[PDB]
């Protein structure tokens, strides 16, 4: 448990933590704001309420 | 000797056209919302085709294009419904500008 001979290993564990930290921040905001592939439930339920299913007669 | 309605319907282009599936028709752009183009082609409903990337500028209101119709009215019935669900529009593919 000496930090003078394992310096190279610590940098790998440190630099990685920094990269992972940014990815978590970017993913959270971007997925909701970014429009890729499928829509979100909140945006898809505004579309299903414009064409509701009618199991009754009118 | 007044023409009846049954004679109009028999000799109408739509009637004689037959099934719209893979039919080449000529449309007229009457409304443009951003890239989307709203096109009438002598039917009950319009079709909404997206502006072609190659020559977007040429597609202004009035431009007459070529379409390949698939449906004249998009309808379907889904689980539990008592009637068909319609989006009030036709399905067609834009094949460019009618170059008279």
Swiss-Prot record, chain A:
Subcellular location: Mitochondrion; Nucleus
Motif Cx9C motif 2, residue numbers: 6-16
Self-association state and partner proteins as the record states: Component of the mitochondrial small ribosomal subunit (mt-SSU). Mature mammalian 55S mitochondrial ribosomes consist of a small (28S) and a large (39S) subunit. The 28S small subunit contains a 12S ribosomal RNA (12S mt-rRNA) and 30 different proteins. The 39S large subunit contains a 16S rRNA (16S mt-rRNA), a copy of mitochondrial valine transfer RNA (mt-tRNA(Val)), which plays an integral structural role, and 52 different proteins.
Family: Belongs to the mitochondrion-specific ribosomal protein mS37 family.
Protein name per UniProt: Small ribosomal subunit protein mS37
Organism of this sequence: Homo sapiens (Human)
Gene: CHCHD1
Whole-protein coverage range: 61 to 118 of 118
Swiss-Prot record, chain B:
Domain of life, per lineage: Eukaryota
Keywords attached to this entry: Acetylation, Disease variant, Mitochondrion, Phosphoprotein, Primary mitochondrial disease, Ribonucleoprotein, Ribosomal protein, Transit peptide
GO cellular component: mitochondrial inner membrane; mitochondrial small ribosomal subunit; mitochondrion
One biological process term in Gene Ontology: mitochondrial translation
One Gene Ontology term of the molecular function aspect: RNA binding
Subcellular localization(s) per the UniProt record: Mitochondrion
Impact after mutating residue 44 to R: In COXPD47; strong decrease in mitochondrial translation and in oxidative phosphorylation biogenesis; this phenotype could be reversed in patient's fibroblasts by transfection with the wild-type protein
Main location: mitochondrion
Positions of modified residues (N6-acetyllysine): 58
Record flagged with keyword Lipid metabolism: no
Family: Belongs to the bacterial ribosomal protein bS1 family.
Known disease link: Combined oxidative phosphorylation deficiency 47: An autosomal recessive, multisystemic, mitochondrial disorder characterized by intrauterine growth retardation, swallowing difficulties with failure to thrive, hypoglycemia, dehydration, and hepatomegaly. Additional features include global developmental delay with impaired intellectual development and absent speech, microcephaly, facial dysmorphism, cataract, sensorineural deafness, skeletal features, and cryptorchidism.
Quaternary structure annotation from Swiss-Prot or TrEMBL: Component of the mitochondrial small ribosomal subunit (mt-SSU). Mature mammalian 55S mitochondrial ribosomes consist of a small (28S) and a large (39S) subunit. The 28S small subunit contains a 12S ribosomal RNA (12S mt-rRNA) and 30 different proteins. The 39S large subunit contains a 16S rRNA (16S mt-rRNA), a copy of mitochondrial valine transfer RNA (mt-tRNA(Val)), which plays an integral structural role, and 52 different proteins.
Protein name, as recorded: Small ribosomal subunit protein bS1m
Lineage: Eukaryota, Metazoa, Chordata, Craniata, Vertebrata
Gene: MRPS28
